[PDB]
Ligand binder design. Structure first.
Ligand code: NA
Lengths: 276, 9, 100
């Protein structure tokens, strides 16, 4: 597959209840491997995949140190945002940050990320050249100017091209037995009458990994979008994913419909029909 | 692991 | 300060069979702000043990959480997920439907 490390931070201010809560989650591809939560009982970077659990005390000490540092920065950012947006210290606000690195086929950085949101909206994002920023508004333009003056794209690009990819390769090597897998979906078609004249055909894909999948319905070989419903891809609970797509069909016409499934764990796209 | 880098808003 | 109503999916880890142990999931997504309450109910009563994933989000900033517990489905019992969120006018309860 094509591999990726990504962290997702959320800070949420809560005046009247102490410092903002900070939550960080780390992923290799679609596998969460670490977490930091400032509201955990002994806040530290905690393992969430067995393979990383074997990293020695240095890993946990430094990771915790950096997570706490990230937490503090987000506390400063929350305060700063109150200034930029003319807001009260007494209201609750949210910062979300995602950053990470995609490992290319040549072992080089294919694509890097560093993007944030304030109260659910774009704030500032690093462009794909990893050398420029997109600010969503006039408040974020303050940050842009700052980061342009302090050479932050350059510093963060060095991490993305160097250390980020080094960690990703280590993790991939260490947790190889479980991370470098492509589990194909278990697939099937079910049938559920709506009335005596209409029925729902539902095409299921279960137990697949990674989360990327394509599921479509055809009628007489034509892509159907009318009377169609595709649910958001959803976790199994066990590190797998699921999705379904349904079509509402006239009774008697069921056998004119095929479901089509594409996934990296499949040697060739699947074609399914209702097999009662 | 997180990056030692981080700049402010 | 934008607000976004949660999507709710309640579903089993594995295709259900009466009497066969399984895992009951409630997947809530696409909500803002992140403050949310989710419960798993059996016959209208909160389950015994119900844990959740760490708060995360997708590339469009939309938050997601998985709430989960062990369950052994059967024809007599009803399972449900109940969500409370600022965007919802009192709780929204979604029943587990083995067809979904
Ligand atoms: Na090294």
């Amino acid at each position: 597959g094509s591999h990726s490390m990504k962290y997702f931070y959320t800070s949420v201010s809560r005046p009247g209840r102490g410092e903002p809560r900070f939550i960080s989650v780390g992923y290799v591809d679609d596998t969460q491997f670490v977490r930091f939560d400032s509201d955990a009982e002994s806040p530290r970077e905690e393992p969430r995949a067995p393979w990383v659990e074997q990293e020695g005390p240095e890993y946990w000490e430094e990771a915790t140190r950096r997570a706490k540092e990230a937490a503090q920065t987000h506390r400063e950012n929350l305060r700063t945002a109150l200034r930029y947006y003319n807001q009260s210290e007494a209201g609750s606000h949210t910062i979300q940050k995602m950053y990470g690195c995609d490992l290319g086929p040549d072992g080089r950085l294919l694509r890097g990320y560093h993007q944030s949101a304030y109260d659910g909206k774009d704030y500032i994002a690093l462009n794909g050249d990893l050398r420029s920023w997109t600010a969503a508004d006039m408040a974020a333009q303050n940050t842009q100017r700052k980061w342009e003056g302090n050479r932050y794209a350059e510093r963060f690009r060095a991490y993305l091209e160097g250390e980020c990819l080094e960690w990703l390769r280590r993790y991939l090597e260490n947790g190889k037995e479980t991370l470098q897998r492509a589990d194909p979906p278990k697939t099937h078609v079910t049938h559920h009458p709506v009335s005596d004249h209409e029925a729902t055909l539902r095409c299921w894909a279960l137990g697949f990994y990674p989360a990327e999948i394509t599921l479509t319905w055809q009628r007489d070989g034509e892509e159907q979008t009318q009377d169609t419903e595709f649910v958001e891809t959803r976790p199994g609970g066990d590190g797998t994913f699921q999705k379904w797509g349904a079509v509402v069909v006239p009774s008697g016409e069921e056998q004119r419909y095929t479901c089509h499934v594409q996934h990296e764990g499949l040697p060739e796209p699947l074609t399914l029909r209702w097999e009662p | 692991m997180h990056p030692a880098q981080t700049s402010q808003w | 300060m934008i607000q976004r109503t949660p999507k709710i999916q309640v579903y089993s880890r594995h295709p259900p069979e009466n009497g066969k142990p399984n895992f009951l999931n409630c997947y809530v997504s696409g909500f803002h702000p992140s403050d949310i309450e989710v419960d798993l109910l059996k016959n209208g009563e909160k389950m015994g043990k119900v844990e959740h994933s760490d708060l995360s989000f997708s590339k469009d900033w939309s938050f997601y959480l998985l709430y989960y517990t062990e369950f052994t489905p059967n024809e007599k019992d009803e399972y449900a997920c109940r969500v409370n969120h600022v965007t919802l006018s009192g709780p929204r309860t979604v029943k587990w439907d083995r067809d979904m």
